[PDB]
Design a protein around this ligand. Structure first.
Ligand SMILES: [Ca+2]
Ligand SMILES: [Ca+2]
Lengths: 393, 394
């Protein structure tokens, strides 16, 4: 028996691992997506799994090994047959937990003896021997296939600041979420500003976020927000908004991260600021000429804005205070869900890219794996999908 | 009684510590500014003090504890009542000594068994018991408060180069002072360049200095000065001068650290340079459009100049030689006194900053400290002063 394993050439650490896949269906096999490192690579055996036991594809199995100790199996009922269509499975791996998801919904959290060694991303399909109680016995049916549409890994941002300010009008339910994530649900408010970011901003920072939810019902801004002191200046890089587009005195424009922004300035007197709730300071703005798409990864190269501002005579303070990816609102209702992240590894799997992936070939895992890995069983379909096969002879 | 103590979250080492404050006046209390490290910070007890005994606010007491041993009290007459206005008190803490100052005047020096363990910066007000001969008896007067307008700590410069070059004309009395400080007194000279700085310059250095004395009597420059090789270039950032403002071939201007400078290029031939007594080289200049005030702190963000020079096609060499904060002179007389500083921790005390400070709360030091620390007694005024109160009851 011949089986298939596709594995990354690089190693990856803590962060969110997502895959879109359709597992094979048959007694005695497994289709999976997992991270792995072990003794053959000079490390302890640290692995995090997503496994579909072909005997019953209406279930998914989650597991993990740390220093070679597994025993963390959690089987969950899916509510659909995973073999009948593509679905997104994922696990967020951090030092104190692992959270697994199905089509974006949280289904299981683990906290005991979590792995810590960066591993490779892997995907395999195989038939077992000696584990009939676990997989059912394999009946030789072939060929069988497991398909994967895309793989994505996003590393941590290291945001250290949480901002949750409301003027007291209406309701602002802000949620300080895990890592760089936050969400806000608001109802008929006065003014507020909620966001995650950094305690000390920087003119060189590159902010990467994703707004999984951007649904202002009225005046809301999805915006890089921060301050400087010496002098006191509040700045904004607005990517999207609600029913009102912020403007002021026009200075010019700046092209950055695929968008063009209008640059403005506005002055403020007697309003809440970081140096006291009744002060006098300017606001610097970059406002996108049209709302940025949300729901996907977006980058704000803050230095291009700082520089274009410098160029139009707008210079910032030298005492840098907080810097966040915010949701601000006024006299409105809405929801927002935003994640600030570190870096993304994106693989569309449209074909075999030999710099970032390798096809296991010419050897068997032995043990319960009753098959040899073959690069010939790792192919790409026309519609740009990884197709893993289990064949015989 | 409830009392107050405000202390830094970070620890600080050798360097100059200054505070602008006005202690409370009353028999029985102490208002202070001091560095502290001890058992509760996991170390030996090292502390340096500035204490105002409320029984007599015309005097100030200096002390220090090293490995839990004190006994170095020194009381000096201020010549004024400390409780009537703000004054600046400081101590310069170095490996081999401590120097204390009042309004910038040296008042006391110690050298024996100098503390060496970095500690927190602290301020407190408290009333004692059992030490009436030292503090007087505390009569319960209340409420009382000590005020502090700002705190500043400046670390050491780590300048590793002393410049003292004269062509031999007239007299150049250069003084290699402590740390980054130097002075020069000169009379009817030829050309000379004196200063302190670094053996290897950097396009990224930020120079903090202060010219305590800037009194050229003729042609003299107060300037950042340095060279590169590959190619050989002499560069200046001139902040002040005497009777002659240096100029050359005009390129443009750069705004930096609050001033605007004119950018110039010039060429020198058959003149001395770090490469020979007779050489030819290029000079790059930034010259302030008007003289920079002296006597108060000044900063030169050198990368602003390097970057503007690059804009105009003035690229520096790749092998960096010395870089100093200099006094240069030609055919003149005069005096200068300049100090290059290290990095600064500046706290204007405009409000509570929980990242760099904490309020002592819910416990008493006990012993002589007849009061409980309360975070509620550490407040900030509208006008940016820290107010540490001593209050009665519950
Ligand atoms: Ca695909
Ligand atoms: Ca102040």
């Amino acid at each position: 028996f011949d089986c298939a394993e596709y594995r990354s050439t690089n190693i990856y650490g803590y962060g969110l691992y997502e895959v879109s896949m359709k597992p094979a269906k048959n007694t005695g096999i497994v289709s999976s997506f997992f991270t792995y490192t072990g003794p053959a690579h000079g490390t302890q055996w640290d692995e995090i799994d997503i496994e579909f036991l072909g005997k019953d594809t209406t279930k998914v199995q989650f597991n993990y090994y740390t220093n070679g100790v597994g025993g963390h199996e959690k089987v969950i009922s899916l509510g659909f047959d995973a073999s009948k269509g593509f679905h997104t499975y994922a696990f967020d791996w951090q030092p104190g937990y692992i959270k697994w998801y199905v089509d974006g919904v949280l289904k299981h959290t683990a906290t005991a003896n979590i792995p810590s060694t960066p591993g490779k991303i892997m995907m395999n399909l195989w038939n077992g021997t000696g584990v009939d109680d676990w997989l059912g016995s394999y009946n030789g049916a072939n060929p069988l296939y497991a398909e994967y549409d895309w793989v994505k890994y996003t590393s941590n941002a290291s945001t250290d600041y949480w901002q949750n300010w409301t003027d007291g009008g209406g309701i602002v339910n802000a949620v300080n979420g895990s890592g760089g994530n936050y969400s806000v649900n608001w109802s008929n408010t006065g003014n507020f500003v909620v966001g995650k970011g950094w305690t000390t901003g920087s003119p060189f920072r590159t902010i990467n976020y994703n707004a999984g939810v951007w649904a202002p019902n009225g005046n809301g801004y999805l915006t890089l927000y921060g301050w400087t002191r010496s002098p006191l200046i509040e700045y904004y890089v607005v990517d999207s908004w609600g029913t009102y587009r912020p403007t002021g005195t026009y200075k010019g424009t700046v092209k950055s991260d695929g968008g063009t922004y209008d640059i403005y300035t506005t002055t403020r007197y007697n309003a809440p600021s970081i140096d006291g709730d009744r002060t006098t300071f300017t606001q610097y703005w970059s406002v996108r000429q049209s709302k940025r798409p949300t729901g996907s990864n977006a980058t704000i190269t803050f230095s291009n804005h700082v520089n274009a501002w410098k160029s139009h005579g707008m210079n910032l303070g030298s005492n840098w205070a907080y810097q966040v990816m915010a949701t601000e609102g006024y006299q409105s209702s809405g929801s927002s869900n935003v994640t600030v992240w570190g870096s993304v590894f994106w693989e569309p799997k449209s074909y075999f890219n030999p710099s970032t992936w390798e096809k296991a070939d010419g050897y068997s895992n032995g043990g319960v794996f009753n098959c040899t890995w073959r690069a010939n069983n790792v192919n790409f379909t026309n519609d740009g999908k990884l197709k893993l096969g289990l064949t015989s002879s």
